[PDB]
Amino acid sequence: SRTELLTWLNGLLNLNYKKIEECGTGAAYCQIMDSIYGDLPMNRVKFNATAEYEFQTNYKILQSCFSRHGIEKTVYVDKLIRCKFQDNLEFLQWLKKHWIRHKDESVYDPDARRKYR
């Protein structure tokens, strides 16, 4: 559920999200992928974005990550970027599964990776 996922995400990345809709900015999605692959351009991810044009940048970074690593999963930016509940709920559900299956043994420091943003 949304509550179970949000709690998981907040603990994983040391975030304080209250609604699934907040994942629509694409920043959290990028960092979940960074925790798994560690080659995301975190400095260029607009982590605390408020303007849609900035969300667009996050999604292009996310899409580039999928392409670089040969991830076949679909990413419908047009649906997610509007911060709609259902679309983001579904994408986050898949991301958690991807994380479970691919996150290795190394420790991840979400705060340091974001330069404490």
Side-chain angles (χ1 to χ4, degrees):
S1 68
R2 55 241 56 185
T3 304
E4 314 179 75
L5 279 182
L6 279 181
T7 292
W8 169 75
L9 182 66
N10 284 334
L12 179 70
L13 300 181
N14 178 50
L15 295 179
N16 190 34
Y17 283 14
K18 301 303 182 187
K19 301 182 297 185
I20 292 297
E21 291 92 314
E22 294 174 65
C23 291
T25 73
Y29 296 156
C30 283
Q31 185 155 39
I32 289 181
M33 293 300 272
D34 189 56
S35 68
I36 303 173
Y37 302 91
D39 68 351
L40 281 284
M42 292 302 295
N43 298 340
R44 291 166 256 151
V45 171
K46 302 302 170 188
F47 212 75
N48 297 292
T50 276
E52 180 178 295
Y53 86 82
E54 294 179 304
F55 306 166
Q56 204 73 59
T57 288
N58 295 339
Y59 282 107
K60 288 185 175 172
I61 286 169
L62 186 70
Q63 279 175 136
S64 288
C65 176
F66 278 52
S67 175
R68 177 169 62 266
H69 294 297
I71 308 307
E72 294 167 54
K73 171 78 182 74
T74 59
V75 187
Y76 313 122
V77 180
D78 31 69
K79 274 70 177 183
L80 299 167
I81 201 167
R82 282 194 171 182
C83 300
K84 185 178 178 179
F85 177 78
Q86 195 54 38
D87 304 278
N88 284 287
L89 174 71
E90 290 177 42
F91 195 64
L92 184 59
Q93 296 179 316
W94 177 85
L95 281 171
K96 182 178 184 181
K97 285 43 163 187
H98 194 67
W99 181 82
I100 288 175
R101 180 175 181 179
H102 299 84
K103 178 65 189 76
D104 67 22
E105 303 70 32
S106 64
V107 71
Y108 186 71
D109 188 335
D111 300 287
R113 292 295 292 175
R114 305 197 281 272
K115 295 210 291 192
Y116 304 87
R117 287 175 289 158

PDB file of all heavy atoms in Angstrom, residues 6-20 22-23 28 47-48 111 114 117:
ATOM      1  N   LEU A   6       5.697   4.232   1.154  1.00  0.00           N
ATOM      2  CA  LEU A   6       6.265   5.495   1.599  1.00  0.00           C
ATOM      3  C   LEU A   6       7.196   5.300   2.783  1.00  0.00           C
ATOM      4  O   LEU A   6       8.276   5.880   2.829  1.00  0.00           O
ATOM      5  CB  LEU A   6       5.159   6.499   1.954  1.00  0.00           C
ATOM      6  CG  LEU A   6       4.546   7.239   0.758  1.00  0.00           C
ATOM      7  CD1 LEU A   6       3.482   8.217   1.239  1.00  0.00           C
ATOM      8  CD2 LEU A   6       5.640   7.984   0.002  1.00  0.00           C
ATOM      9  N   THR A   7       6.782   4.478   3.739  1.00  0.00           N
ATOM     10  CA  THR A   7       7.610   4.222   4.906  1.00  0.00           C
ATOM     11  C   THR A   7       8.930   3.591   4.462  1.00  0.00           C
ATOM     12  O   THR A   7       9.997   3.956   4.952  1.00  0.00           O
ATOM     13  CB  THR A   7       6.880   3.300   5.905  1.00  0.00           C
ATOM     14  OG1 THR A   7       5.762   4.009   6.466  1.00  0.00           O
ATOM     15  CG2 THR A   7       7.817   2.867   7.028  1.00  0.00           C
ATOM     16  N   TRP A   8       8.849   2.655   3.521  1.00  0.00           N
ATOM     17  CA  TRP A   8      10.043   1.989   2.999  1.00  0.00           C
ATOM     18  C   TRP A   8      10.958   3.003   2.331  1.00  0.00           C
ATOM     19  O   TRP A   8      12.149   3.051   2.614  1.00  0.00           O
ATOM     20  CB  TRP A   8       9.660   0.926   1.966  1.00  0.00           C
ATOM     21  CG  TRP A   8      10.841   0.387   1.191  1.00  0.00           C
ATOM     22  CD1 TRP A   8      11.789  -0.494   1.637  1.00  0.00           C
ATOM     23  CD2 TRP A   8      11.200   0.712  -0.159  1.00  0.00           C
ATOM     24  NE1 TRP A   8      12.712  -0.738   0.648  1.00  0.00           N
ATOM     25  CE2 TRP A   8      12.376  -0.011  -0.464  1.00  0.00           C
ATOM     26  CE3 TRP A   8      10.644   1.544  -1.141  1.00  0.00           C
ATOM     27  CZ2 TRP A   8      13.004   0.070  -1.715  1.00  0.00           C
ATOM     28  CZ3 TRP A   8      11.270   1.626  -2.382  1.00  0.00           C
ATOM     29  CH2 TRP A   8      12.439   0.890  -2.655  1.00  0.00           C
ATOM     30  N   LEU A   9      10.390   3.810   1.437  1.00  0.00           N
ATOM     31  CA  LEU A   9      11.156   4.820   0.711  1.00  0.00           C
ATOM     32  C   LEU A   9      11.800   5.854   1.627  1.00  0.00           C
ATOM     33  O   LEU A   9      12.966   6.216   1.451  1.00  0.00           O
ATOM     34  CB  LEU A   9      10.251   5.537  -0.296  1.00  0.00           C
ATOM     35  CG  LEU A   9      10.917   6.597  -1.174  1.00  0.00           C
ATOM     36  CD1 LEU A   9      11.915   5.929  -2.101  1.00  0.00           C
ATOM     37  CD2 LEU A   9       9.851   7.339  -1.976  1.00  0.00           C
ATOM     38  N   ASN A  10      11.036   6.345   2.598  1.00  0.00           N
ATOM     39  CA  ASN A  10      11.557   7.349   3.514  1.00  0.00           C
ATOM     40  C   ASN A  10      12.741   6.832   4.315  1.00  0.00           C
ATOM     41  O   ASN A  10      13.690   7.570   4.560  1.00  0.00           O
ATOM     42  CB  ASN A  10      10.461   7.844   4.467  1.00  0.00           C
ATOM     43  CG  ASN A  10       9.494   8.806   3.799  1.00  0.00           C
ATOM     44  OD1 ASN A  10       9.843   9.489   2.832  1.00  0.00           O
ATOM     45  ND2 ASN A  10       8.275   8.882   4.326  1.00  0.00           N
ATOM     46  N   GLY A  11      12.684   5.569   4.723  1.00  0.00           N
ATOM     47  CA  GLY A  11      13.781   5.002   5.486  1.00  0.00           C
ATOM     48  C   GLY A  11      14.983   4.743   4.593  1.00  0.00           C
ATOM     49  O   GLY A  11      16.124   4.997   4.978  1.00  0.00           O
ATOM     50  N   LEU A  12      14.717   4.252   3.388  1.00  0.00           N
ATOM     51  CA  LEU A  12      15.766   3.942   2.425  1.00  0.00           C
ATOM     52  C   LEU A  12      16.593   5.156   2.028  1.00  0.00           C
ATOM     53  O   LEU A  12      17.820   5.100   2.014  1.00  0.00           O
ATOM     54  CB  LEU A  12      15.154   3.332   1.160  1.00  0.00           C
ATOM     55  CG  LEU A  12      16.133   2.973   0.037  1.00  0.00           C
ATOM     56  CD1 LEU A  12      16.979   1.779   0.450  1.00  0.00           C
ATOM     57  CD2 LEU A  12      15.366   2.653  -1.232  1.00  0.00           C
ATOM     58  N   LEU A  13      15.920   6.256   1.699  1.00  0.00           N
ATOM     59  CA  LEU A  13      16.623   7.457   1.256  1.00  0.00           C
ATOM     60  C   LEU A  13      16.643   8.613   2.249  1.00  0.00           C
ATOM     61  O   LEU A  13      17.075   9.716   1.912  1.00  0.00           O
ATOM     62  CB  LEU A  13      16.018   7.938  -0.067  1.00  0.00           C
ATOM     63  CG  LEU A  13      16.090   6.935  -1.222  1.00  0.00           C
ATOM     64  CD1 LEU A  13      15.486   7.540  -2.471  1.00  0.00           C
ATOM     65  CD2 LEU A  13      17.541   6.541  -1.464  1.00  0.00           C
ATOM     66  N   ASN A  14      16.201   8.358   3.475  1.00  0.00           N
ATOM     67  CA  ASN A  14      16.141   9.411   4.483  1.00  0.00           C
ATOM     68  C   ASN A  14      15.354  10.602   3.950  1.00  0.00           C
ATOM     69  O   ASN A  14      15.846  11.740   3.917  1.00  0.00           O
ATOM     70  CB  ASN A  14      17.535   9.876   4.896  1.00  0.00           C
ATOM     71  CG  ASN A  14      17.487  11.004   5.908  1.00  0.00           C
ATOM     72  OD1 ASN A  14      16.784  10.914   6.914  1.00  0.00           O
ATOM     73  ND2 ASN A  14      18.230  12.077   5.645  1.00  0.00           N
ATOM     74  N   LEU A  15      14.133  10.321   3.515  1.00  0.00           N
ATOM     75  CA  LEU A  15      13.238  11.341   2.992  1.00  0.00           C
ATOM     76  C   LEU A  15      12.082  11.499   3.969  1.00  0.00           C
ATOM     77  O   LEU A  15      11.960  10.733   4.929  1.00  0.00           O
ATOM     78  CB  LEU A  15      12.705  10.938   1.614  1.00  0.00           C
ATOM     79  CG  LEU A  15      13.749  10.837   0.498  1.00  0.00           C
ATOM     80  CD1 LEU A  15      13.087  10.405  -0.804  1.00  0.00           C
ATOM     81  CD2 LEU A  15      14.433  12.185   0.334  1.00  0.00           C
ATOM     82  N   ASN A  16      11.246  12.503   3.732  1.00  0.00           N
ATOM     83  CA  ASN A  16      10.101  12.757   4.593  1.00  0.00           C
ATOM     84  C   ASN A  16       8.861  12.989   3.740  1.00  0.00           C
ATOM     85  O   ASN A  16       8.119  13.955   3.944  1.00  0.00           O
ATOM     86  CB  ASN A  16      10.376  13.973   5.486  1.00  0.00           C
ATOM     87  CG  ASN A  16       9.334  14.149   6.569  1.00  0.00           C
ATOM     88  OD1 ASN A  16       8.804  13.171   7.098  1.00  0.00           O
ATOM     89  ND2 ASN A  16       9.043  15.400   6.920  1.00  0.00           N
ATOM     90  N   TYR A  17       8.642  12.101   2.772  1.00  0.00           N
ATOM     91  CA  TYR A  17       7.481  12.210   1.892  1.00  0.00           C
ATOM     92  C   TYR A  17       6.213  11.825   2.650  1.00  0.00           C
ATOM     93  O   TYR A  17       6.236  10.927   3.490  1.00  0.00           O
ATOM     94  CB  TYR A  17       7.643  11.289   0.676  1.00  0.00           C
ATOM     95  CG  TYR A  17       8.595  11.779  -0.407  1.00  0.00           C
ATOM     96  CD1 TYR A  17       9.486  12.833  -0.178  1.00  0.00           C
ATOM     97  CD2 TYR A  17       8.620  11.160  -1.654  1.00  0.00           C
ATOM     98  CE1 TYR A  17      10.385  13.255  -1.176  1.00  0.00           C
ATOM     99  CE2 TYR A  17       9.511  11.570  -2.655  1.00  0.00           C
ATOM    100  CZ  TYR A  17      10.385  12.613  -2.408  1.00  0.00           C
ATOM    101  OH  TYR A  17      11.260  12.997  -3.403  1.00  0.00           O
ATOM    102  N   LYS A  18       5.106  12.500   2.349  1.00  0.00           N
ATOM    103  CA  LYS A  18       3.839  12.201   3.012  1.00  0.00           C
ATOM    104  C   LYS A  18       2.853  11.559   2.042  1.00  0.00           C
ATOM    105  O   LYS A  18       1.925  10.857   2.452  1.00  0.00           O
ATOM    106  CB  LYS A  18       3.221  13.481   3.587  1.00  0.00           C
ATOM    107  CG  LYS A  18       4.094  14.213   4.588  1.00  0.00           C
ATOM    108  CD  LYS A  18       4.478  13.330   5.757  1.00  0.00           C
ATOM    109  CE  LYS A  18       5.300  14.099   6.776  1.00  0.00           C
ATOM    110  NZ  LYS A  18       5.825  13.213   7.848  1.00  0.00           N
ATOM    111  N   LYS A  19       3.058  11.799   0.754  1.00  0.00           N
ATOM    112  CA  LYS A  19       2.175  11.260  -0.272  1.00  0.00           C
ATOM    113  C   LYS A  19       2.942  10.678  -1.446  1.00  0.00           C
ATOM    114  O   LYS A  19       3.999  11.180  -1.818  1.00  0.00           O
ATOM    115  CB  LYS A  19       1.245  12.358  -0.795  1.00  0.00           C
ATOM    116  CG  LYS A  19       0.374  12.991   0.270  1.00  0.00           C
ATOM    117  CD  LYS A  19      -0.569  14.032  -0.332  1.00  0.00           C
ATOM    118  CE  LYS A  19       0.199  15.188  -0.954  1.00  0.00           C
ATOM    119  NZ  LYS A  19      -0.717  16.272  -1.429  1.00  0.00           N
ATOM    120  N   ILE A  20       2.390   9.619  -2.031  1.00  0.00           N
ATOM    121  CA  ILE A  20       2.999   8.967  -3.181  1.00  0.00           C
ATOM    122  C   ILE A  20       3.195   9.973  -4.308  1.00  0.00           C
ATOM    123  O   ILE A  20       4.183   9.911  -5.041  1.00  0.00           O
ATOM    124  CB  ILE A  20       2.111   7.813  -3.703  1.00  0.00           C
ATOM    125  CG1 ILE A  20       2.077   6.676  -2.682  1.00  0.00           C
ATOM    126  CG2 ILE A  20       2.613   7.334  -5.054  1.00  0.00           C
ATOM    127  CD1 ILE A  20       3.417   6.033  -2.429  1.00  0.00           C
ATOM    128  N   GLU A  22       4.268  12.829  -4.392  1.00  0.00           N
ATOM    129  CA  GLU A  22       5.531  13.561  -4.322  1.00  0.00           C
ATOM    130  C   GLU A  22       6.637  12.896  -5.130  1.00  0.00           C
ATOM    131  O   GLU A  22       7.631  13.533  -5.469  1.00  0.00           O
ATOM    132  CB  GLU A  22       5.975  13.718  -2.866  1.00  0.00           C
ATOM    133  CG  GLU A  22       5.046  14.606  -2.045  1.00  0.00           C
ATOM    134  CD  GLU A  22       5.415  14.642  -0.578  1.00  0.00           C
ATOM    135  OE1 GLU A  22       6.507  15.154  -0.246  1.00  0.00           O
ATOM    136  OE2 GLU A  22       4.612  14.151   0.244  1.00  0.00           O
ATOM    137  N   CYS A  23       6.472  11.615  -5.436  1.00  0.00           N
ATOM    138  CA  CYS A  23       7.476  10.911  -6.226  1.00  0.00           C
ATOM    139  C   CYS A  23       7.403  11.325  -7.688  1.00  0.00           C
ATOM    140  O   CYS A  23       8.263  10.970  -8.490  1.00  0.00           O
ATOM    141  CB  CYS A  23       7.282   9.401  -6.118  1.00  0.00           C
ATOM    142  SG  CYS A  23       7.654   8.743  -4.495  1.00  0.00           S
ATOM    143  N   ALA A  28      13.399  11.014  -6.387  1.00  0.00           N
ATOM    144  CA  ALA A  28      13.526   9.784  -5.610  1.00  0.00           C
ATOM    145  C   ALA A  28      13.783   8.581  -6.515  1.00  0.00           C
ATOM    146  O   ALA A  28      14.588   7.711  -6.181  1.00  0.00           O
ATOM    147  CB  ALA A  28      12.263   9.554  -4.771  1.00  0.00           C
ATOM    148  N   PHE A  47      16.957  17.348  -6.813  1.00  0.00           N
ATOM    149  CA  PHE A  47      16.343  16.620  -5.722  1.00  0.00           C
ATOM    150  C   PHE A  47      15.181  17.298  -5.029  1.00  0.00           C
ATOM    151  O   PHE A  47      14.176  16.653  -4.726  1.00  0.00           O
ATOM    152  CB  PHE A  47      17.395  16.229  -4.685  1.00  0.00           C
ATOM    153  CG  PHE A  47      17.084  14.942  -4.008  1.00  0.00           C
ATOM    154  CD1 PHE A  47      17.272  13.736  -4.676  1.00  0.00           C
ATOM    155  CD2 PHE A  47      16.505  14.931  -2.746  1.00  0.00           C
ATOM    156  CE1 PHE A  47      16.881  12.538  -4.107  1.00  0.00           C
ATOM    157  CE2 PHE A  47      16.106  13.732  -2.162  1.00  0.00           C
ATOM    158  CZ  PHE A  47      16.294  12.531  -2.845  1.00  0.00           C
ATOM    159  N   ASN A  48      15.309  18.594  -4.773  1.00  0.00           N
ATOM    160  CA  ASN A  48      14.253  19.341  -4.113  1.00  0.00           C
ATOM    161  C   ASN A  48      13.622  20.318  -5.100  1.00  0.00           C
ATOM    162  O   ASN A  48      13.571  21.518  -4.858  1.00  0.00           O
ATOM    163  CB  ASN A  48      14.833  20.076  -2.901  1.00  0.00           C
ATOM    164  CG  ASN A  48      15.381  19.119  -1.857  1.00  0.00           C
ATOM    165  OD1 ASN A  48      14.626  18.388  -1.214  1.00  0.00           O
ATOM    166  ND2 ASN A  48      16.702  19.105  -1.695  1.00  0.00           N
ATOM    167  N   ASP A 111      22.303  10.458   1.948  1.00  0.00           N
ATOM    168  CA  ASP A 111      22.575  11.861   2.215  1.00  0.00           C
ATOM    169  C   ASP A 111      23.864  12.332   1.546  1.00  0.00           C
ATOM    170  O   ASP A 111      23.883  13.365   0.874  1.00  0.00           O
ATOM    171  CB  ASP A 111      22.625  12.086   3.728  1.00  0.00           C
ATOM    172  CG  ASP A 111      21.316  11.715   4.404  1.00  0.00           C
ATOM    173  OD1 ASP A 111      20.335  12.474   4.255  1.00  0.00           O
ATOM    174  OD2 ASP A 111      21.258  10.654   5.064  1.00  0.00           O
ATOM    175  N   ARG A 114      23.698  12.780  -2.164  1.00  0.00           N
ATOM    176  CA  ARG A 114      22.946  13.979  -2.565  1.00  0.00           C
ATOM    177  C   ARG A 114      23.649  15.253  -2.109  1.00  0.00           C
ATOM    178  O   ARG A 114      23.081  16.339  -2.232  1.00  0.00           O
ATOM    179  CB  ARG A 114      21.563  14.052  -1.899  1.00  0.00           C
ATOM    180  CG  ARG A 114      20.625  12.905  -2.054  1.00  0.00           C
ATOM    181  CD  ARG A 114      19.224  13.397  -1.689  1.00  0.00           C
ATOM    182  NE  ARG A 114      18.948  13.495  -0.252  1.00  0.00           N
ATOM    183  CZ  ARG A 114      18.481  12.489   0.485  1.00  0.00           C
ATOM    184  NH1 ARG A 114      18.246  11.310  -0.074  1.00  0.00           N
ATOM    185  NH2 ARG A 114      18.207  12.666   1.772  1.00  0.00           N
ATOM    186  N   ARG A 117      21.443  17.239   0.400  1.00  0.00           N
ATOM    187  CA  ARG A 117      20.262  17.966  -0.033  1.00  0.00           C
ATOM    188  C   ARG A 117      19.099  17.053   0.375  1.00  0.00           C
ATOM    189  O   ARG A 117      18.000  17.169  -0.206  1.00  0.00           O
ATOM    190  CB  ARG A 117      20.262  18.153  -1.557  1.00  0.00           C
ATOM    191  CG  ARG A 117      21.269  19.172  -2.103  1.00  0.00           C
ATOM    192  CD  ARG A 117      21.245  19.177  -3.634  1.00  0.00           C
ATOM    193  NE  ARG A 117      21.844  17.960  -4.188  1.00  0.00           N
ATOM    194  CZ  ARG A 117      21.602  17.478  -5.405  1.00  0.00           C
ATOM    195  NH1 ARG A 117      20.760  18.100  -6.220  1.00  0.00           N
ATOM    196  NH2 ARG A 117      22.222  16.373  -5.815  1.00  0.00           N
TER     197      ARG A 117
END
